CSV table of C-alpha atoms and ligand atoms in Angstrom, one decimal:
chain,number,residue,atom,x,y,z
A,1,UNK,CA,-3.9,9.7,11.8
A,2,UNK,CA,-7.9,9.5,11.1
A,3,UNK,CA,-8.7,7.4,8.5
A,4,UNK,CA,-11.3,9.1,6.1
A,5,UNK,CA,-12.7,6.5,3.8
A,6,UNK,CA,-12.0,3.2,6.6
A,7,UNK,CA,-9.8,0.9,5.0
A,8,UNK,CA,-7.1,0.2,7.7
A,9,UNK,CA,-4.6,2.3,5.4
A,10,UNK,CA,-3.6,6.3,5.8
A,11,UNK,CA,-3.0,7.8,2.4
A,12,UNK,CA,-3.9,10.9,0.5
A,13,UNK,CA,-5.3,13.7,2.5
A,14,UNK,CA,-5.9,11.3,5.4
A,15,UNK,CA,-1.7,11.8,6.2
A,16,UNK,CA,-2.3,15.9,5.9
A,17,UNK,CA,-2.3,16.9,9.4
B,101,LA,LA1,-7.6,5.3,3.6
């Protein structure tokens, strides 16, 4: 996963692919 705001979590739309 990529990480779109850089928090050290994947939620939302990061977990879309
Ligand atoms: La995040």
């Amino acid at each position: 996963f990529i990480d779109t705001n850089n928090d050290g979590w994947i939620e939302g739309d990061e977990l879309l692919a």
